[PDB]
Design a protein around this ligand. Structure first.
Ligand SMILES: [Ca+2]
Ligand SMILES: [Ca+2]
Lengths: 157, 157
């Protein structure tokens, strides 16, 4: 259990596992986002391959949070740039100062702390969204999307 | 309090308010999404105008959930189409069968129920994302975005 030997794990199961193993808790909604970001065969659950992908990232994020935190479980908003730098999955991704500011507002609590579940969500989403662009763009400058393409990319994540 | 008379409400305050007034609870992360979707002056809090915008929607969603639910607090996944139909803010938005399927996977729990906080998130996000497209598209068929435009739209929400 929480090993995914040819079996699957859904968001509800994933939540119980992450909260028991890693921990500020992961919400069920966040786990549904994690499933959405990591699915290859889209069916609302993670097979062994998809789970391995998620797990490798989670292990990595644990290390990054441990390295960057000011104290056990406390990562400061002003150190979020260091979390990005320490996340190899983001290689080649450069965000603007303004975008960093927006993500800081979105992922940090009211006293300038970023929880582990919040950091996980942010780093996985940043990677997914940056890779979508880089992979779909024909010139690396812009992206053209159909309505249906746009809506699917922005709604299932 | 929870009235926002020239004052502001942040996501943490918003969470306490929504959970006390409406309720399955809103997570803090969901409240940060709600703030992001409703901001006009982007600073991580809702001023009186932004809060009014959020509140009008929330009142509407309450009515829709009450109308469509199978029993107190139980909205079935298979009835999500009826929630969309009953939400005037979505007027002019048509989603595909496939997109409906994806959102069902993303917003429903493991037994085919959609919680009130999940419905709120879904209906607000659908509206925001559809309006972005409709408003940015020059022909109503496609959208061209710069990298920076793409990343900002997909990360702050
Ligand atoms: Ca799958
Ligand atoms: Ca504001």
């Amino acid at each position: 259990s929480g090993l995914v030997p040819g079996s699957d794990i859904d968001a509800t199961q994933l939540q119980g596992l992450l909260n028991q193993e890693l921990l500020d808790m992961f919400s069920l909604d966040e786990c549904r986002s994690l499933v959405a970001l990591m699915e290859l065969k889209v069916n609302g659950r993670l097979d062994q391959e998809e789970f391995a992908r998620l797990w490798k990232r989670l292990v990595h994020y644990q290390h990054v949070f441990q390295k960057v935190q000011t104290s056990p479980g406390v990562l400061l908003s002003s150190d979020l740039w260091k979390a990005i730098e320490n996340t190899d999955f983001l290689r080649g991704i450069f965000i603007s100062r303004e975008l960093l500011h927006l993500v800081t507002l979105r992922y940090s609590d009211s006293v300038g702390r970023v929880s582990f579940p919040s950091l996980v969500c942010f780093l996985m989403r940043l990677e997914a969204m940056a890779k979508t662009f880089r992979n779909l763009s024909k010139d690396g400058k812009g992206l053209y999307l159909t309505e249906m393409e746009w809506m699917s990319l922005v709604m299932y994540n």
